[PDB]
Amino acid sequence: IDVLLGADDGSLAFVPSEFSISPGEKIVFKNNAGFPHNIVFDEDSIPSGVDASKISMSEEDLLNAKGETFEVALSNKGEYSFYCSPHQGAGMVGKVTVN
Ligand SMILES: [Cu+2]
Numbered sequence: 001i002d003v004l005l006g007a008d009d010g011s012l013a014f015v016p017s018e019f020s021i022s023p024g025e026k027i028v029f030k031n032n033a034g035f036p037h038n039i040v041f042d043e044d045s046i047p048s049g050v051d052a053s054k055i056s057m058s059e060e061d062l063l064n065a066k067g068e069t070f071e072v073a074l075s076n077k078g079e080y081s082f083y084c085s086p087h088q089g090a091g092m093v094g095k096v097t098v099n
Pocket of ligand 1: 012034035036037038084085086087092
């Protein structure tokens with residue numbers, strides 16, 4: 001599944017922000033508008049036992065230019081909440097379910 005970082009109207013959003021995938025499926029996050037952006041999985045809101053650092057950018061890492069990507073595939077089943085760290089309070093958050 002492809003996910004935009006920033007909407008085409010400049011809104012600070014993942015598009016889509018809620019979605020489901022199958023184990024081993026890739027998510028390609030693509031820097032779109034309103035960047036810099038990143039994608040950070042909330043270590044307390046992903047399935048037990050998953051290493052957030054295997055699937056996340058650090059909060060200090062940024063995609064600063066249009067078209068840059070971060071790709072990650074998730075295997076373990078369950079709900080994963082994530083956010084863009086500089087835009088989290090503006091509402092740039094999401095949740096992917098692996099089912
Ligand atoms: Cu952002």
